[PDB]
Write a protein that binds this ligand. Structure first.
Ligand SMILES: CCCCCCCCCCCCCCCCCC(=O)OC[C@H](COP(=O)([O-])OCC(O)COP(=O)([O-])OC[C@@H](COC(=O)CCCCCCCCCCCCCCCCC)OC(=O)CCCCCCCCCCCCCCCCC)OC(=O)CCCCCCCCCCCCCCCCC
Ligand SMILES: CCCCCCCCCCCCCCCCCC(=O)OC[C@H](COP(=O)(O)OCCN)OC(=O)CCCCCCCCCCCCCCCCC
Ligand SMILES: NC(=O)C1=CN([C@@H]2O[C@H](COP(=O)(O)OP(=O)(O)OC[C@H]3O[C@@H](n4cnc5c(N)ncnc54)[C@H](OP(=O)(O)O)[C@@H]3O)[C@@H](O)[C@H]2O)C=CC1
Ligand code: SF4
Ligand code: SF4
Ligand code: SF4
Ligand code: SF4
Ligand SMILES: [K+]
Ligand SMILES: [Zn+2]
Lengths: 125, 114, 176, 112, 145, 207, 360, 94, 95, 341
C-alpha cells in the first residue's frame, strides 16, 4: 500500500555531497551554442547542466593547471528544460535557466542573385 | 503524491526510528572509545553523535528519514564490529583540517570562493 | 563432446587389491613423487645471470619514451596533439605556438611517467613518428619527481637512444 | 537403474514414471484454480499434458528421456516440482490481471 | 564520405596570399566554396575578394597584394569550412576538443555581442561568436574577436 | 558475402520475438514493453512491482528455465524522473538462451530484493546499493561492499564527480591516515569530442 | 579452527574502473580490460572487442578471429598455470609453481613479440587485432606447444595421485549442481559438479565452432575434481592451439573499414581520406550506434561478460563488467560450512579469484 | 644439452620420462631474432571500383530495436531445447 | 643556441629561464637543469635549399613511410623559398 | 610579491601558500611538526640536514611533489648555510642538543650556529627569521644549556634585529624528552627528585601549540622583532607533574629525595655514554629549574593559539608506556594533577 508524502522532493542529505558544494554553487541550465567554426547542429539538440567556474592555478613543480573544485568537469545532459530544473531542485542547487536559441527561418532564393532592379544582385559567382 | 514507503508510513513512525538509533549510538560511544583506544573523551564522542543528528533536524519526508536511519545503522554496525579502523572513526573530527572562515572579509582575503 | 576427469571403478581382483595394499603401506606413489624432484635437481636451471645476461625482447617492446628528430636534426613533433588526445591515462600535456621562424612546434611536452600505462597508443597515434616508446626499461629513480618528464628530458632520450630506436622501427614498420 | 545422475546433489529416482505422473497430475489440479482464460493456465496445461502423454506412452526410461528432451529423468522431475511451486505462487500473484500502471512518458526511451 | 582514396596522381599546390595580420591564408586547403567572397561582398560590403583564373587553377584571393581589413574581417575565419583561412593570433596554440567553452558577453562596445570564451587549463585561448538573432546574428567585430 | 558486415540471424530474431510476446501474454499485469535488438537480444520491461513474479516465472516455468542470474546492475539516467534502471541478465542452460529484464526506481523508492529467486543476487544488490543508492527491501544483509568504510555518496551516479570529494594521506602529527578535501595537482582535462554532424539517421529523434 | 562464518570484505582493490570508462572513447577504454582479470589479459580484451563489434554491426576478418582463438587458448594456459600452482602453493606444495612459471615466462614472450608488452598487451581490439604476427612466431609457439604436455605430466606426477594432495582436496568445498546454478557460478565451478556447460560449445564466438575439443566434467563437485578439470582443460587448450597453428589463414587482421579500424601507416601518410580517418579515430574515436548488449565469453575463470550501453556517441554510456569471481567469492561462505581454517585456504584457491575483476 | 651420459640416465630414470627429447630450455630450434621483412596482404575493400562505402557500411545497417509489445496457440520457448552432449571418442574417461 | 642568463642559468630552446628572485630555481641547487643542447631551430637552418625544376614539388620527409605525410609545395613566388610545413626543408625553383 | 609566491588554491596539499621556508634542525622533535604544518598548506620547504638520508625519510610524505627539498649542510661551513637560505623568504632555526658531544658543545649549537645562520640569512636578504630560544634562558643559570641560550638569544637579536625569537617551556608530545623522560625512570624503580620535587614549578607546553605559534608568526607581520614566551595553560609542582605521569602510565610511583650533589653525580655517570645519554647533569638542572613568569612578553594568545592543557594530551604520549593490563584505560580514569593559581 502507498502513502501520501506532501513535500517537494529534497535529497541533499542523502547524496553525500559536502555542504559547501550544494549552496555556494550555481548551476547553469542551457542548450549549448553551435560551435561557430562548423555548420553541424547535432551538438545543439540536448540540454546541459554545468556549474560555475572556480579557480585554476599553476602547479609549482610542472606548471600544470591545478584545481580544488570537485565539480569543475561535471556536466549533465537532459532531454528537456523541465528535466534539468527538476534535477536541480531535488539536489538543492541554485540554478539559472536560459531559453533555447533556435535559428530563425530564412527566405532563400537563388534567383535573387540576378535581380533586375534590386540590390541583392551579386557582382560575382 | 502517492509513493511507496520504505519503513515508516508517516513522520511520527519515522521519529520513533530516529530516537531508537540515537539510543544505540549513545550506548555505543563508551565502547567505541575503549575498543579503538581514542584520545577523545566519551562526552566528545556523544557530542559528535548529537552534532550529526542535528544537521538533519529539518527533514520532513519520512522516506528521507528512513534512509538516513538506514545509513546510520550501517554506520553503527561498521563501528561495533570493528570493521572501521581508528582512522575511519576519527574522520568525523577533521583534526588535520584548518578552520575555514565564514565571514565575508576573511573569505575575501584568501581567494575567490563565495 | 565432453570427458570425465574422475569416474573410475577400481579393480577388486586380489592382485589389484594387493597392489593398492603395497602402495598404502610402502608409500610407492610418494616415492614416485620424490623421483620427479630428484630429476629436476640434476637438470640445468633456467636462471640467467642478470645484469650480465638479459631476458630476450623484440623490436616491438614498449619502454621509456623519447622524442625523435628528422635526419637534419629538426624535431619530428608538430604539436598536433593526437598523442595527447588518445592517451588513455591523460599522461601527456602539450602547449605549442609558432616558433621564431614559422614552424609549428611545442613549447611544453610533458609525460607523467607515473600516470602512463606504457600502452603505446601515443606512438600509434603520432603521424610523424615523433613520440615513440623506446627499448629502455632500466630507468627506476630514487624520487617521484624524476619520473615527470618535460620536453628537455624526452628530447635527450631521443638523442640518447636514436641509434637503437631507428633500428627497431626499421624492423617493425612494415607490420604497422 | 542408473548408478548416478551425474549431477552432484541430484539423487537417482527409483520410480521415475510414477513420480512424473503424480507431479504432472498435481500441476493440472493446481491449474484448475487459475481463471480459465489466463494465459498461464492455457499454456501450462498444454505443455503439462504433452509431457504426461510421453510418460504414459514410453515405458523405457532411456527412451522417455529421449522424448521429453529435458535432460536426465531426475532433471525432469525437479523441473516438474519447480513448475508446481510456480503454479501455487501464480495463484496469489494473479499476473493475468491488467497492467498495474503505465510507466512515465518516456521511461523506456533510449537514447535520451 | 568513403573511408579510403583511389586518387593515384599528384596534387595541386597553390601559393599563399597576405591579407593582413589577422587572417592567415594556407590556400592549398581552399575548396573553392566562395563563402569568403560572398561574406566580403554582402556582409562587410567590401568587394576585394574574388576568384582568378578558371578550371582547376581557379584561385580565391585579391589578385593584387591587398589587405582585407574590415572591422568584420575576422568572420571569414569562422565561415571558411576548411583551414584555408585561420586566425593568426590563435595559430597552433590549441585544439578544439581540449577547450572549455564559456558563454559570455562582449564589452568592447554597447552592442552586447554574444560570444564564447574558449579557455584551456585556466587560460583564455580565443573568442568566438555566439548566435543571437536579435543582436549580432553570428558575427563579431575584430576588436571583439 | 559482405566481409566486413556482421551477418544477421533472422531465425533467432523470430524465435525471441515469439517468446517475448509469450511472456507478455502470461504476465500482462507487469510487462510494459518487449523489444528485440538487431543483434538478437530480448529485453522485457516490467513494472517494479513485478520483479519477484517475473523473475520467479522465468526461473521456474518449464518453457523458460532461466536458472542462472548472469548479471544484475543499474544504470543512472538523470533526465528521467525514475533515474535508475535496474537490469537483470538471465541465462537458460536448458534452451541455450539469454533474456534481459529491466525495471526502474528513483532515490527514495525501494525495489524488492530478488535473493529469494537467485541467491546470486545478494552481492549484486549490495553493489547497486553501494554504487547507486538504490535500496533493496528485505535484503538479508545490505551494506556497502566496494567503497571505503564510512564512504559518503554513491560514486556511479552521473552527478558524482569522477575524483570524488575527499582524498587520503598519512599525517605525521596525528600518526594516522586522514581524509581531506580533494585537490588535484593536475585537473582532469574535459574533452569535447562529439561531432556536430549526425552519424546514424536510423536513430534520429523527431524534432 | 573450525570456520563458522566467512564474511569476505572486498573493495580493497576497487578502482572505479566502470566510472573511468565513461570518460574514455571505446579505444581508450580497452586497456582497462587488460587490468581486470590481470592473468587472462587477452581474453578480457576479446570479450570487450566482441561487445563493441556487436554494437557496431561489423565483423573482424577470419585471420584476426583465428589469432584471437590462438591467443585466447595461450591465455587460458597462463591462467590455469597460475590457478593450479598458486592453489598448490597455498596448500603447501611450492615446487610446481617454479617449474610452471618458466613456461609462463615463455608465454609472456609470445605476448611481447606480438604487442611489445608481456602482460597488458592491448592487442585484441574491436575490429580484429592491432598488428599481424611477426614472422617466425608460429614456429616458436609450435616449439613451445610440442613440449608443454610433458610439463603437465610432471605437475600430475606431483599432485594427482598424491595421497596428501587428495586428502587436502577430496570432498572439500562440495557444491551441488543446483546450488552452483542458483548462486551464479560459471566455468569450472559449474562443470566440477557435473553441469555440462561451456560457452565455447553452446554459444561459440570467433572461430570456436571450427576447432575440436572436449569439455572436462567432474563428478563430485569438490576441489579435487575442479583441480582435475583445470589440468585437463590445459591439455585441451594445447589441442586447440595445435589446430590454430595448422588452420591459420592468410589475409588482413583488422576490419577493412577505416571508419572503425585505423588505416595502415603507409596509407595515412599518402591518402587524404586515410589521414582524415586516422586523425578522427585517434581523437574523437568511432561512434557506436545507440544500444545495449550483454556479451559473454568462456573466460579461463568462467563466464566473463560486459553489459555495454551506447548512447550513439564515441564514449560508452555505461559499462557494467561481469566478473565470474564476483559470484564465486559470494559463495565462499556457503562452500566453507563444516570445514576448518586450512580448508578455506583450499576453497579460496579452487574458486580461482583475482580481485582486479572482483573489485574492478 | 650439456649433461653427461650418466646424469642423463639418472634423471631420465628418476622422472620415468625421456627428458632429453623434450627439453624445457630452448636452444637452436627457435627462430632467428632477425627475420626477412614481411609484405602483408590487403583486405577486401582495397578495390578501385565497385567499392562504394554505402554498400559495405556495417554501422549504418544497425537498426533500433523492434518493439514486440508496448503498453502504450502453441506454447514457445526462447529456443529449441539444447541437444544432449556426446562422450568423446578421443578419451571418454581421463 | 644555449645562452646563459645573467644569473648563469641556461636558457632552453623554448626561451625558458627562471628570472632573478624566482625561488623555483632552488630546485637545481646541488643538482642540475636538464637542457637539450641540439636546438632544432638552428639545425634545420643549416640544411641547404634544394633547387628543383618545377613549379610544384612534394616532400614526405625522406625514408618513405618512415617520414611524414606527403605534401606538395608551391614554388611560384620568387621572393622566398617553399618550406615544408612538416619537416622544414626548403625548396626553390631552378629558374 | 613575486608572481611565483602569490598564494593560490584552498590551503591544501596541492595549493601554493607562498611561503619558501628554510628550516634548520628539521629532523628533530620540533622540526617534524613544523615541516608537517608547512607542507599541509603547500609551502616550499628546504630541509638542510646533517644526518644520514634514512633519517629524513619520515619528512618526505609531508609535501606535494617537489615541495620538500633536502640539502646537506655543516654548522661550521657558511657556504652550505648560504646555499640553503638564498632563495627563502623565512628561515626557521630549530637546531639544538640536550647534551654536549666531542665535536659540538652548547656554545657551538646555541650561539655559534644560530649566529652564523642569522648572519648569513641577513646577507642573503632573507626577510623573516624565527629563532627558538628557551623560556628559562639565563646567564645566571646553573645549566650551561640555559646560559648558552641566553647568550645566543642576545647574539641573534643584534645580528638579525627583525628576528622573531620564541621562548618555549618544556614541550610535551609523542617524541618529547619530557613526559617520556619521566616515564622511562621506571626502569630504575623509584623516581629520584631533588627535594622531592616540591621546590620546582613547571609550565609545560604542547608541541602542536608551539608549532601553530611558529606558523602564525611567519604570516603575522606583527611578529617581526618581537619575543614571545610559549607556555602552557597551567603551572604544576614537579612532584605532582611526575606523579601525574605515572598515574596516566599506570606505573607504581615511589618518589624519594636525592640531594643535588648526589643526583648531579648520577648525571655525570650517565654522561659516559658515547651515544645519546639517557640523562646528563645539565638535564637534571633544567628539569628542576622553575619555569619563569614573564608577563611583559607576548604569549601564544597573541598569535591566535589556545594553549592545550596537559590533561587533554598526556594519554596521547603515555599510552605506550603502559603494560597490556592497562593499555585500554580511557582518558577519564586519572584525576588531574593539582595546579597553581
Ligand atoms: C661433501 C661433498 C662435496 C665434496 C666432493 C666434491 C666433488 C667434486 C666437485 C666437482 C664439481 C665440478 C665439476 C667441474 O669440473 O666443473 C664443471 C664446470 C665446467 O663444466 P660444464 O661444461 O659447465 O658442465 C659440466 C657438465 O657437462 C654438466 O654437469 P653434469 O650434470 O653433466 O654432471 C657432470 C659431473 C658433475 O659432478 C661432478 O663432477 C662432481 C661429482 C661429485 C658427487 C658428490 C655427491 O658429474 C658427472 O660427471 C657424473 C658423475 C658424478 C657423480 C654423480 C652422483 C649423483 C648422486 C647419486 C644419485 C642419487 C643422489 C641421491 O666447471 C666449473 O664451473 C667449476 C666450478 C666449481 C664447482 C664446485 C666444485 C667444488 C665442490 C666443493 C668441493 C668441496 C668443498
Ligand atoms: C615374519 C614376521 C614379520 C612381522 C613384521 C612384518 C610387517 C611388514 C609390513 C608392515 C608394514 C610396513 C609399513 C609400515 C609403515 C607405516 C605404513 C603406513 O601406515 O602408511 C600408511 C599411511 C596412511 O595413509 P592413508 O593411505 O591415507 O590411510 C590409509 C587408510 N586410512 O600413510 C603414510 O604414512 C604416508 C606418510 C606421508 C608422509 C611421507 C613423507 C615422506 C615420504 C618419504 C619417506 C621415505 C621413507 C624413508 C625411511 C627412512 C629410514 C630411516
Ligand atoms: N623541550 C623542548 O623540546 C624544548 C626545545 N627547545 C628548543 O627547540 C629546538 C628544537 O627542540 P628539539 O626539536 O627538541 O631539538 P632536537 O634535539 O629534537 O632536534 C635537534 C635538531 O637540531 C639538529 N642539530 C643538533 N645539533 C646539530 C649540529 N651540531 N649540527 C647540525 N644540526 C644539529 C638535529 O639534527 P640531527 O638529527 O642531524 O642531529 C635535529 O634536527 C632546540 O633549539 C631546542 O633547544 C626549547 C625549549 C624546550
Ligand atoms: S604509452 Fe599510453 S599511457 Fe603512456 S603516454 Fe603513451 S598513450 Fe599515454
Ligand atoms: S608527438 Fe606526434 S602525435 Fe604527439 S603532438 Fe607531436 S606530432 Fe602530434
Ligand atoms: S571560405 Fe575558405 S574554402 Fe571557401 S572559398 Fe573562401 S578560403 Fe576557400
Ligand atoms: S583539418 Fe580539414 S581543412 Fe585542415 S587539412 Fe584536414 S581536412 Fe583539410
Ligand atoms: K576556418
Ligand atoms: Zn617535409
Amino acid at each position: 500500500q502507498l502513502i501520501t508524502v506532501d513535500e517537494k522532493l529534497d535529497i541533499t542529505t542523502i547524496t553525500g555531497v559536502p555542504e559547501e558544494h550544494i549552496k555556494t554553487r550555481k548551476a547553469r541550465i542551457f542548450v549549448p551554442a553551435r560551435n561557430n567554426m562548423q555548420s553541424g547542429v547535432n551538438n545543439t539538440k540536448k540540454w546541459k547542466m554545468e556549474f560555475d567556474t572556480r579557480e585554476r592555478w599553476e602547479n609549482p613543480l610542472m606548471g600544470w593547471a591545478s584545481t580544488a573544485d570537485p565539480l569543475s568537469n561535471l556536466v549533465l545532459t537532459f532531454s528537456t528544460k523541465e528535466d534539468a530544473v527538476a534535477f536541480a531542485e531535488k539536489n538543492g542547487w541554485s540554478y539559472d535557466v536560459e531559453e533555447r536559441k533556435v535559428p530563425k527561418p530564412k527566405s532563400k532564393s537563388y534567383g535573387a542573385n540576378f535581380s533586375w532592379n534590386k540590390r541583392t544582385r551579386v557582382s560575382t559567382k | 503524491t502517492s509513493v511507496k514507503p520504505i519503513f515508516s508510513r508517516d513522520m511520527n513512525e519515522a521519529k520513533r526510528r530516529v530516537r531508537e538509533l540515537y539510543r544505540a549510538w549513545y550506548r555505543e560511544v563508551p565502547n567505541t572509545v575503549h575498543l579503538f583506544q581514542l584520545d577523545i573523551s566519551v562526552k566528545q564522542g556523544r557530542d559528535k553523535v548529537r552534532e550529526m543528528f542535528k544537521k538533519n533536524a529539518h527533514i520532513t519526508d519520512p522516506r528521507v528519514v528512513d534512509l538516513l536511519v538506514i545509513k546510520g545503522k550501517m554506520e553503527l554496525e561498521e563501528t561495533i564490529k570493528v570493521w572501521k579502523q581508528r582512522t575511519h572513526v576519527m574522520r568525523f573530527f577533521h583534526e588535520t583540517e584548518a578552520p575555514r572562515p565564514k565571514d565575508f572579509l576573511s573569505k575575501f582575503y584568501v581567494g575567490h570562493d563565495p | 563432446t565432453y570427458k570425465y576427469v574422475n569416474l573410475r571403478e577400481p579393480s577388486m581382483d586380489m592382485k589389484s587389491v594387493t597392489d593398492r595394499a603395497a602402495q598404502t603401506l610402502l608409500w610407492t606413489e610418494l616415492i614416485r613423487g620424490l623421483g620427479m624432484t630428484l630429476s629436476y635437481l640434476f637438470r640445468e636451471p633456467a636462471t640467467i645471470n642478470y645484469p650480465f645476461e638479459k631476458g630476450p625482447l623484440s623490436p616491438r617492446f614498449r619502454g621509456e619514451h623519447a622524442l625523435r628528430r628528422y635526419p637534419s636534426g629538426e624535431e619530428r613533433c608538430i604539436a598536433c596533439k593526437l598523442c595527447e588526445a588518445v592517451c588513455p591515462a591523460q599522461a601527456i600535456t602539450i602547449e605549442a605556438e609558432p616558433r621564431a621562424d614559422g614552424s609549428r612546434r611545442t613549447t611544453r611536452y610533458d609525460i607523467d611517467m607515473t600516470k602512463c600505462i606504457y600502452c603505446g597508443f601515443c606512438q600509434e597515434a603520432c603521424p610523424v613518428d615523433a613520440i615513440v616508446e623506446g627499448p629502455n626499461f632500466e630507468f627506476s629513480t630514487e624520487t617521484h619527481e624524476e619520473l615527470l618528464y618535460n620536453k628537455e628530458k624526452l628530447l635527450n632520450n631521443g638523442d640518447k637512444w636514436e641509434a637503437e630506436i631507428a633500428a627497431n622501427i626499421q624492423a617493425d614498420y612494415l607490420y604497422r | 537403474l542408473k548408478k548416478t545422475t551425474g549431477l552432484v546433489g541430484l539423487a537417482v529416482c527409483e520410480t521415475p514414471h510414477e513420480r512424473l505422473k503424480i507431479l504432472y497430475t498435481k500441476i493440472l489440479d493446481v491449474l484448475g484454480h487459475i481463471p480459465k482464460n489466463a494465459a498461464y493456465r492455457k499454456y501450462t496445461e498444454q505443455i503439462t499434458n504433452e509431457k504426461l502423454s510421453m510418460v504414459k506412452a514410453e515405458p523405457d526410461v532411456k527412451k522417455l528421456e529421449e522424448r521429453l528432451q529435458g535432460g536426465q529423468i531426475e532433471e525432469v522431475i525437479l523441473q516438474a516440482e519447480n513448475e508446481l511451486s510456480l503454479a501455487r505462487k501464480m495463484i496469489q500473484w494473479k499476473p493475468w490481471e491488467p497492467l498495474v500502471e503505465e510507466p512515465p512518458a518516456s521511461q523506456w526511451k533510449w537514447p535520451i | 564520405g568513403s573511408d579510403r582514396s583511389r586518387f593515384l596522381e599528384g596534387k595541386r599546390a597553390v601559393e599563399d596570399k597576405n591579407i593582413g595580420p589577422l587572417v592567415k591564408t594556407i590556400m592549398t586547403r581552399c575548396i573553392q566554396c566562395t563563402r569568403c567572397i560572398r561574406f566580403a561582398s554582402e556582409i562587410a560590403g567590401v568587394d576585394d575578394l574574388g576568384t582568378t583564373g578558371r578550371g582547376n587553377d581557379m584561385q580565391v584571393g585579391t589578385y593584387i597584394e591587398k589587405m582585407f581589413m574590415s572591422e568584420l574581417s575576422g568572420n571569414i575565419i569562422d565561415i571558411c569550412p576548411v583551414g584555408a583561412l585561420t586566425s593568426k593570433p590563435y595559430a597552433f596554440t590549441a585544439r578544439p576538443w581540449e577547450t572549455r567553452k564559456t558563454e559570455s558577453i562582449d564589452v568592447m562596445d554597447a552592442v552586447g555581442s554574444n560570444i564564447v570564451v574558449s579557455t584551456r587549463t585556466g587560460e583564455v585561448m580565443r573568442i568566438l561568436p555566439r548566435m543571437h538573432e536579435d543582436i549580432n546574428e553570428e558575427w563579431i567585430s575584430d576588436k571583439t574577436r | 558475402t559482405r566481409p566486413t558486415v556482421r551477418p544477421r540471424n533472422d531465425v533467432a530474431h523470430k524465435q525471441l520475438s515469439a517468446f517475448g510476446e509469450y511472456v507478455a501474454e502470461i504476465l500482462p499485469k507487469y510487462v510494459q514493453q518487449v523489444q528485440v535488438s538487431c543483434f538478437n537480444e530480448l529485453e522485457i520491461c516490467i513494472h517494479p512491482d513485478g520483479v519477484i513474479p517475473v523473475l520467479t516465472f522465468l526461473r521456474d516455468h518449464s518453457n523458460a528455465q532461466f536458472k542462472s542470474l548472469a548479471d544484475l546492475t543499474a544504470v543512472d539516467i538523470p533526465t528521467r524522473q525514475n533515474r535508475f534502471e535496474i537490469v537483470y541478465n538471465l541465462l537458460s542452460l536448458r534452451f541455450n538462451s539469454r533474456i534481459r529484464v529491466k525495471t526502474y526506481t528513483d532515490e527514495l523508492t525501494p525495489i524488492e530484493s530478488s535473493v529469494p529467486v537467485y541467491k546470486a543476487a545478494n552481492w549484486y544488490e549490495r553493489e547497486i546499493w553501494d554504487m547507486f543508492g538504490v535500496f533493496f527491501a528485505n535484503h538479508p544483509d545490505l551494506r556497502r561492499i566496494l567503497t571505503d568504510y564510512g564512504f559518503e555518496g554513491h560514486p556511479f551516479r552521473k552527478d558524482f564527480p569522477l575524483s570524488g570529494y575527499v582524498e587520503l594521506r598519512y599525517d605525521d602529527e596525528v600518526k594516522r591516515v586522514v581524509a581531506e578535501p580533494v585537490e588535484l595537482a593536475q585537473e582532469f582535462r574535459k574533452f569535447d569530442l562529439n561531432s556536430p554532424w549526425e552519424a546514424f539517421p536510423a536513430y534520429r529523434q523527431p524534432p | 579452527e573450525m570456520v563458522r562464518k566467512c564474511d569476505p570484505h572486498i573493495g580493497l582493490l576497487h578502482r572505479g574502473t566502470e566510472k573511468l570508462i565513461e570518460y574514455k572513447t571505446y579505444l581508450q577504454a580497452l586497456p582497462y580490460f587488460d587490468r581486470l582479470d590481470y592473468v587472462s589479459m587477452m581474453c578480457n580484451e576479446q570479450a570487450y572487442s566482441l561487445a563493441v563489434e556487436k554494437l557496431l554491426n561489423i565483423r573482424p576478418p577470419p585471420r584476426a578471429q583465428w589469432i584471437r582463438v590462438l591467443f585466447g587458448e595461450i591465455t587460458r594456459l597462463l591462467n590455469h598455470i597460475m590457478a593450479v600452482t598458486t592453489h598448490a602453493l597455498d596448500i603447501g606444495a611450492m615446487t610446481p609453481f617454479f617449474w610452471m612459471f618458466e613456461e609462463r615466462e615463455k608465454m609472456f614472450e609470445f605476448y611481447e613479440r606480438v604487442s611489445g608488452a608481456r602482460m597488458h598487451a592491448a592487442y585484441v581490439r574491436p575490429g580484429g587485432v592491432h598488428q599481424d604476427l611477426p614472422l617466425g612466431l608460429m614456429d616458436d609457439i609450435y616449439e613451445f606447444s610440442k613440449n608443454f604436455s610433458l610439463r603437465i605430466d610432471e605437475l600430475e606426477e606431483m599432485l594427482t595421485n598424491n595421497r596428501i594432495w587428495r586428502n587436502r582436496t577430496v570432498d572439500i568445498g562440495i557444491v551441488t549442481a543446483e546450488d552452483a546454478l542458483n548462486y551464479g557460478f560459471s566455468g569450472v565451478m559449474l562443470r566440477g559438479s557435473g553441469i555440462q556447460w561451456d560457452l565455447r560449445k553452446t554459444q561459440p564466438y570467433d572461430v570456436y565452432d571450427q576447432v575440436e575439443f572436449d569439455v572436462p566434467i567432474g563428478s563430485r563437485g569438490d576441489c579435487y575434481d575442479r583441480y582435475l578439470c583445470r589440468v585437463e582443460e590445459m591439455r585441451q587448450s594445447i589441442r586447440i592451439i595445435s589446430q590454430c597453428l595448422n588452420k591459420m589463414p592468410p589475409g588482413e587482421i583488422k576490419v577493412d573499414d577505416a571508419k572503425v579500424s585505423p588505416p595502415k601507416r603507409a596509407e595515412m601518410k599518402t591518402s587524404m581520406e586515410s589521414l582524415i580517418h586516422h586523425f578522427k579515430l585517434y581523437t574523437e574515436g568511432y561512434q557506436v550506434p545507440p544500444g545495449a548488449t550483454y556479451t559473454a565469453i568462456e573466460a579461463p575463470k568462467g563466464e566473463f561478460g560486459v553489459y555495454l550501453v551506447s548512447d550513439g556517441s564515441s564514449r560508452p554510456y555505461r559499462c557494467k563488467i561481469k566478473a565470474p569471481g564476483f559470484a564465486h567469492l559470494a559463495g565462499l561462505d556457503k562452500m566453507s560450512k563444516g570445514h576448518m581454517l586450512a580448508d578455506v585456504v583450499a576453497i579460496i584457491g579452487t574458486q580461482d579469484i583475482v580481485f582486479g575483476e572482483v573489485d574492478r | 644439452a650439456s649433461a653427461t651420459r650418466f646424469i642423463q640416465w639418472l634423471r631420465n630414470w628418476a622422472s620415468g620420462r625421456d627428458l632429453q627429447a623434450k627439453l624445457q630450455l630452448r636452444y637452436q630450434e627457435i627462430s632467428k631474432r632477425t627475420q626477412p621483412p614481411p609484405k602483408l596482404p590487403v583486405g577486401p575493400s582495397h578495390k578501385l571500383s565497385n567499392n562504394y562505402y554505402c554498400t559495405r557500411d556495417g554501422r549504418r545497417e544497425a537498426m533500433p530495436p523492434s518493439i514486440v509489445m508496448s503498453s502504450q496457440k502453441k506454447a514457445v520457448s526462447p529456443a529449441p531445447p539444447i541437444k544432449r552432449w556426446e562422450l568423446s571418442q578421443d578419451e571418454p574417461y581421463l | 643556441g644555449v645562452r646563459t642568463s645573467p644569473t648563469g642559468e641556461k636558457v632552453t630552446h623554448t626561451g625558458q629561464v627562471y628570472d632573478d628572485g624566482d625561488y623555483r630555481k632552488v630546485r637545481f641547487v646541488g643538482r642540475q637543469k636538464e637542457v637539450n643542447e641540439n636546438f632544432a631551430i638552428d639545425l634545420i637552418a643549416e640544411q641547404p635549399v634544394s633547387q628543383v625544376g618545377s613549379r610544384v614539388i612534394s616532400c614526405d620527409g625522406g625514408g618513405g613511410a618512415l617520414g611524414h605525410p606527403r605534401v606538395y609545395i608551391n614554388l611560384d613566388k620568387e621572393t622566398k623559398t617553399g618550406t615544408c610545413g612538416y619537416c622544414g626543408l626548403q625548396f626553390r625553383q631552378q629558374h | 610579491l613575486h608572481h611565483a609566491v602569490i598564494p593560490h588554491g584552498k590551503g591544501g596539499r596541492s595549493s601554493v601558500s607562498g611561503i619558501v621556508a628554510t628550516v634548520f634542525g628539521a629532523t628533530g622533535f620540533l622540526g617534524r611538526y613544523v615541516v608537517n604544518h608547512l607542507g599541509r598548506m603547500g609551502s616550499q620547504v628546504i630541509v638542510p640536514h646533517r644526518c644520514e638520508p634514512y633519517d629524513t625519510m619520515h619528512l618526505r610524505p609531508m609535501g606535494d611533489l617537489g615541495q620538500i627539498i633536502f640539502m646537506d649542510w655543516n654548522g661550521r661551513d657558511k657556504d652550505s648555510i648560504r646555499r640553503a637560505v638564498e632563495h627563502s623568504s623565512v628561515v626557521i632555526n630549530l637546531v639544538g642538543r640536550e647534551w654536549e658531544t666531542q665535536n659540538f658543545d652548547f656554545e657551538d649549537v646555541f650561539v655559534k650556529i644560530p649566529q652564523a645562520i642569522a648572519q648569513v640569512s641577513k646577507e642573503a636578504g632573507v626577510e623573516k627569521f624565527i629563532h627558538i630560544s628557551h623560556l628559562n634562558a639565563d646567564i645566571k643559570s646553573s645549566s650551561k644549556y640555559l646560559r648558552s641560550k641566553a647568550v645566543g638569544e642576545k647574539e641573534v637579536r643584534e645580528t638579525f634585529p627583525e628576528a622573531t625569537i620564541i621562548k618555549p617551556a618544556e614541550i610535551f608530545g609523542r617524541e618529547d624528552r619530557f613526559l617520556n623522560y619521566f616515564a622511562n625512570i621506571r626502569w630504575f624503580g623509584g623516581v629520584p627528585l631533588i627535594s622531592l620535587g616540591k621546590k620546582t614549578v613547571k609550565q609545560p607546553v604542547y608541541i602542536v601549540d608551539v608549532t601553530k605559534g611558529i606558523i602564525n608568526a611567519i604570516k603575522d607581520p606583527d611578529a617581526r622583532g618581537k619575543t614571545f614566551a610559549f607556555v602552557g595553560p597551567s603551572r604544576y609542582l614537579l612532584f605532582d607533574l611526575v606523579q601525574y605521569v605515572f598515574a596516566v602510565a599506570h606505573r607504581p610511583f615511589l618518589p624519594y629525595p636525592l640531594p643535588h650533589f648526589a643526583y648531579r653525580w648520577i648525571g655525570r655517570l650517565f654522561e659516559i655514554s658515547p651515544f645519546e645519554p639517557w640523562t646528563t647533569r645539565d638535564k637534571v638542572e633544567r628539569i628542576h629549574t622553575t619555569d619563569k613568569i614573564l608577563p611583559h612578553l607576548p604569549g601564544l594568545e597573541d598569535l591566535g593559539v589556545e594553549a592545550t592543557p596537559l590533561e587533554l594530551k598526556a594519554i596521547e604520549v603515555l599510552r605506550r608506556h603502559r603494560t597490556y593490563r592497562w593499555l585500554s584505560s580511557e582518558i577519564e580514569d586519572v584525576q588531574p594533577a593539582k595546579t597553581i593559581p
